[PDB]
Write an enzyme that holds these catalytic residues in place. Sequence first.
Site, short mmCIF file in Angstrom:
data_model
loop_
_atom_site.label_atom_id
_atom_site.label_comp_id
_atom_site.label_asym_id
_atom_site.label_seq_id
_atom_site.Cartn_x
_atom_site.Cartn_y
_atom_site.Cartn_z
N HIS A 84 -78.15 6.85 -20.50
CA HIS A 84 -77.88 6.25 -21.85
C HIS A 84 -76.47 5.65 -21.95
CE1 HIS A 84 -76.50 10.05 -23.84
NE2 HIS A 84 -76.04 9.20 -24.83
N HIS A 86 -73.60 5.67 -23.60
CA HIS A 86 -72.59 6.30 -24.17
C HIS A 86 -71.75 6.78 -23.15
CE1 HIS A 86 -74.57 7.69 -28.23
NE2 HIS A 86 -74.21 6.38 -28.24
N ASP A 88 -69.88 9.17 -22.10
CA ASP A 88 -70.12 10.41 -21.38
C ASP A 88 -71.11 10.28 -20.11
OD1 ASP A 88 -72.22 10.39 -23.45
OD2 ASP A 88 -72.44 12.62 -22.91
N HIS A 149 -82.18 10.16 -29.03
CA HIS A 149 -80.70 10.51 -28.94
C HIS A 149 -80.27 9.16 -29.15
CE1 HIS A 149 -76.67 11.37 -28.21
NE2 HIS A 149 -76.51 10.96 -27.38
N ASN A 180 -74.45 14.62 -31.95
CA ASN A 180 -74.22 13.46 -32.43
C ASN A 180 -75.44 12.46 -32.47
OD1 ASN A 180 -73.02 10.56 -32.91
ND2 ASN A 180 -72.82 10.14 -30.71
ZN LIG Z 1 -75.04 9.92 -26.36
#
Ligand SMILES: [Zn+2]
Length: 232
Positions: A84, A86, A88, A149, A180
């Site tokens: 995904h 994000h 990280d 998520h 999150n």
């Molecule tokens: Zn994430």
Amino acid sequence: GEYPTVSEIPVGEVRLYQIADGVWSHIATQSFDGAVYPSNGLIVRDGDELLLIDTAWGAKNTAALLAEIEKQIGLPVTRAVSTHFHDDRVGGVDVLRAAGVATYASPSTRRLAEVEGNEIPTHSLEGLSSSGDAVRFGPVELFYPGAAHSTDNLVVYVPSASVLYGGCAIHELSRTSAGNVADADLAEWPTSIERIQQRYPEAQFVIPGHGLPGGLDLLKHTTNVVKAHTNR
Ligand SMILES: [Zn+2]
Ligand SMILES: [Cl-]
Ligand SMILES: [Cl-]
Ligand SMILES: [Zn+2]
């Protein structure tokens, strides 16, 4: 073998764990909001090459990941997929690209990474835009289970080894909060988990985005946690 924890992995280092034949997780200790925790990704042998799933969050950590892979495995990483948008999971893509790795993500992920100002995998994965869509990608199947998520989150299944990597759509047993949820779809998350259960009822090893692997119990755990958060 004992699964590595934050106490075996100094900040900035990466360890690999062989889950099964030709399948590993990579584990990196990360810092966030006052706490430290271990983040998982996946490595899958693809003939004499390697498929990487997810970065190690940032340029320095992803360089360390590539070094640890060379140390422990010694085969070239030729492709990478980010699960995904994000930071990280795409942070470190520029390092992979510079090292000659072909980087991939869905168009959905690429779009949202760009809006966010994150690094953007170069290649686009077609055929994953609708919930329930699956595509073969070398030694894995990529699956878009629906929003969870995040709206773009993918999960990865290794048919040869019955390993399912859920990224941040699946929680470890020791997690009590939903994590999150800024970009999550709480209403759709339990439906998306059910799609995963329905598609991979034969999974033997389930790897959460953070923390300890388990079995398919992790899916029910994740729905339990998600319900609890919904009912806060
Ligand atoms: Zn994430
Ligand atoms: Cl499509
Ligand atoms: Cl393929
Ligand atoms: Zn539980």
